[PDB]
From a paper:
We have recently determined the structures of the N-terminal Calponin Homology (CH) domain of human CEP44 and the so-called Spd2 domain of human CEP192. Both structures were obtained through X-ray crystallography at a resolution of 2.3 and 2.1 Å, respectively, and were experimentally phased. The N-terminal domain of CEP44 shares a weak sequence similarity to various CH domains, most of which members of the IFT81/NDC80/Hec families, whereas the Spd2 domain retrieves sequence matches to members of the PapD-like superfamily.
The common isoform of human CEP192 is 2537 residues long and a sequence analysis of its C-terminal part suggests the presence of eight tandem domains that are similar to members of the PapD-like superfamily. The human CEP192 domains 4 and 5 constitute the so-called Spd2 domain that is ubiquitously present in all SPD2/CEP192 homologues and represents the most conserved region amongst them. Its highest sequence conservation is found in two motifs, as judged by multiple sequence alignment of orthologous sequences: Motif 1 (PLXGYGG) located at the C-terminal end of domain 4, and Motif 2 (GDEXXR) located within domain 5. The crystal structure of the human Spd2-domain revealed two seven-stranded Ig-like β-sandwiches with distinctive kinks (β-a1/ β-a2 and β-c’1/ β-c’2) at the edges, a feature that is characteristic for the PapD-like superfamily. The two constituent domains pack together to form an extended cradle-like structure. The two highly conserved motifs PLXGYGG and GDEXXR define the interface between both domains via an extensive network of interactions. Intriguingly, Motif 2 is found within a large (60 residue) insertion that precedes the C-terminal β-strand g of domain 5 and consists of a helix (α1) and an irregular part that wraps around it before proceeding to complete domain 5. This insertion defines a unique feature that is essential for maintaining the cradle-like conformation of the Spd2 domain. The comparison of the Spd2 crystal structure with the AF2 predicted model (AF-Q8TEP8-F1-model_v1) revealed striking similarity with 273 structurally equivalent residues superposed with rmsd of 1.83 Å.
Residue numbers in the entry: 1763 to 2079
The structure:
């Protein structure tokens, strides 16, 4: 073994159209004696969207030269820019020609490159935007009576999104909502590119409670979102290898108990998933690319906020 790599492939997943994402790999000259002369080339059907950036190493500064001297036991660090310019799954090759010295013949190494142009982009409408979360208030609650409010999830991206909504009574202690008190409908759905879908919070505040029946309540809804193609890649990865979810996530993660495999509302029969090659890190890319939207839900009761007159307390300097 002459040349080693810390990565057998580079998989980018989704990058928005007109945007760019850098990824690196390290090549090591395994020889303790001999220097190799490497020629780095991008080839393949989507070579126009994978661009070699300047190379550096453990014994050399930044160079724009595609020809690299790699000294014995030197690591060189190769940078590839993924710059997609069309709504497609993309394949290319990093070709590493180890130039022959007659005594040793010419060996060509291949690192497959993959990614897709265009991504989902999820925002909420009909709710307040705070700095790092959204907020909605359900006013005029009455214990033992059903209240409904409607907000919207908008996908401003160029690809369909999955949306999985999970609600928490207490988010730190990870006590799920009783759906008979507060539930989200739909709680799992596919949202087409440049479309907006309505989501309903169905609020049935308990009249069983002893004391704080009309006390102002706070709940936390998490909307886990990402590219539908990413969820299809994830599905495909879990068929070939039964159990990968536990290994990857933290043991105490909320995502531990969330099903992304089962049928979502308005899921399509056709995606570009089969244009993407299966990779060992598809499950990692799925959870890695996933967004978490925070929606705080305040329940205000008529008797406590609406019916009580807000007056100035006892004031002194």
């Amino acid at each position: 073994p002459s040349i080693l790599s810390n990565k057998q492939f580079l998989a980018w997943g989704g990058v928005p159209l007109g945007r760019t994402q850098l990824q690196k790999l390290a090549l090591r000259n395994n020889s303790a004696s001999t220097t190799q002369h490497l020629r780095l080339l991008i080839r393949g059907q989507d070579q126009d969207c994978f661009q070699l950036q300047n190379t550096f190493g453990s014994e050399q500064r930044l160079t724009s030269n595609c020809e690299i001297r790699i000294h014995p036991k030197e690591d060189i660090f190769i940078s590839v820019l993924f710059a997609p310019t069309r709504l497609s799954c993309m394949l290319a090759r990093l070709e590493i020609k180890q130039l022959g010295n007659r005594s040793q013949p010419g060996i060509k190494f291949t690192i497959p490159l993959s990614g897709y142009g265009g991504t989902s982009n999820l925002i909420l409408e009909g709710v307040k935007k705070l700095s790092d979360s959204y907020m909605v208030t359900v006013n005029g609650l009455v214990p033992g009576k059903e209240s409904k409010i409607v907000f919207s999830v908008r996908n401003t991206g160029s690809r369909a999104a999955f949306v999985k909504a999970v609600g928490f009574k207490d988010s730190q202690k990870k006590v799920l909502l009783d759906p008979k008190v507060l539930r989200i409908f739909p709680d799992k759905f596919v949202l087409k590119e440049r479309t907006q879908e309505n989501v309903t919070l169905i609020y049935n505040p308990s009249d069983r409670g002893i004391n704080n029946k009309t006390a102002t309540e706070l709940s936390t809804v998490y909307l886990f979102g990402g590219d539908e193609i990413s969820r299809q890649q994830y599905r495909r990865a879990l068929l070939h290898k039964p159990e990968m979810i536990k290994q990857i996530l933290p043991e105490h993660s909320v995502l531990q108990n969330i099903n992304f495999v089962e049928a979502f509302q308005d899921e399509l029969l056709v995606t570009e998933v089969y244009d993407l090659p299966q990779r060992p890190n598809d499950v990692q890319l799925f959870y890695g690319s996933m967004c978490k939207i925070i929606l705080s839900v305040i329940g205000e009761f008529r008797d406590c906020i609406s019916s009580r007159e807000f007056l100035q307390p006892s004031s002194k300097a």
